């Protein structure tokens, strides 16, 4: 429950080699859960 | 004696012919909702056919002659087997997509009826079926009026009658894979199933 906070924060992948995770999870679960839903959950902007 | 006699008999040819007829007949009977009983009886006949094969493959050693003969028969009848496996997996993924949330927000109907166009868009968004598969699924779908489709009934229509035949096919494929290792042709069927 506590880890739910950094899902949408822009600085989620700090102190970790992969800063492109959010994109990987988007490309992995976009079709099933919904691209817009994944974007809202992870705090990303598709156009940006 | 009996197993070897069947192995050297012309039974295989009959098996290939039955596979062809089954593969085309299930696809045709799926579209029409008035032939559900005929489809179920056809599935039961196919189940008994798979049981006989399983029984022909009783007590065989690793790399058995009968095992290689049945693998050769399968690769001879590859197309029909692929059609049957595709028939199963299409409805499995249809059930999963119906349960999925994307279709839930696509339908936008309290009555539980999905339009043909919206169903096509939802499938194209899921990106799991090819275009001909979309057309065939739409054809099998039964629209009561104004292209309103009852997706729940459409998904559950072919679940129960096809459970036994699918399990028998899976058991046969597992037995063939575990008793005939290092066969490049069988891996194609294993990955398609």
Describe, in plain words, how this protein is organized in 3D:
The structure is cut from a larger assembly and holds 2 copies of chain A. With about 50 residues, chain A is mostly helical. Chain A is about 45% helix and about 0% strand. Chain A is built from 2 helices and no strands. The first copy, chain A, has helices spanning about 20-35, 35-40. Chain A is globular and about 30 Å long. The interface of A and B includes residues 31, 32, 33, 34 and 37 of A. The PDB classes it as transport protein. The entry lists the keywords Ion channel, Ca2+, tetramer, transport protein. The entry is titled "Structure of RyR1 in detergent in primed state in complex with nanobody and FKBP". Chains A, B: Ryanodine receptor 1.
User: Between the first and last Cα atoms of chain A, what is the distance in angstroms?
Assistant: 29 Å
Task: Figure out the total of helices of chain A.
Answer: 2
Strand count, sense and barrel status of the largest sheet of chain A are: none
Most residues in contact: chain pair: A-B, 5 and 8 residues
Structural class of chain A: mainly alpha
Oligomer: part of a larger assembly
Range of strand content of chain A: under 5%
Cα shape of chain A: globular
Radius of gyration of chain A: 11 Å
Helix fraction bin of chain A: 40-55%
H/E element sequence of chain A = HH
Total beta strands of chain A: 0
């Amino acid at each position: 429950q506590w880890d739910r906070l950094v899902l949408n924060t822009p600085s989620f992948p700090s102190n970790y080699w992969d800063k492109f995770v959010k994109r990987k999870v988007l490309d992995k679960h976009g079709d099933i859960f919904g691209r817009e839903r994944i974007a809202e959950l992870l705090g990303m902007d598709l156009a940006s | 004696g009996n197993q070897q006699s069947l192995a050297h008999s012309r039974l295989w040819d009959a098996v290939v012919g039955f596979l062809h007829v089954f593969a085309h007949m299930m696809m045709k009977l799926a579209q029409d909702s008035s032939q559900i009983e005929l489809l179920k009886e056809l599935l039961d006949l196919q189940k008994d056919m798979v049981v006989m094969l399983l029984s022909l493959l009783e007590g065989n050693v690793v790399n058995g002659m009968i095992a290689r003969q049945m693998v050769d028969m399968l690769v001879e009848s590859s197309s029909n087997v692929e059609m049957i496996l595709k028939f199963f997996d299409m409805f499995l993924k249809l059930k999963d997509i119906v349960g999925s949330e994307a279709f839930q927000d696509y339908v936008t109907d309290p009555r539980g009826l999905i339009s043909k166009k919206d169903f096509q868009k939802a499938m194209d968004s899921q990106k799991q079926f090819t275009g001909p598969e979309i057309q065939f699924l739409l054809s099998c779908s039964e629209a009561d009026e104004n292209e309103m489709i009852n997706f729940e009934e459409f998904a559950n229509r072919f679940q129960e009658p096809a459970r036994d035949i699918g399990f028998n096919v899976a058991v046969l494929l597992t037995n063939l894979s575990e008793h005939v290792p290092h066969d490049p042709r069988l891996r194609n069927f294993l990955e398609l199933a």
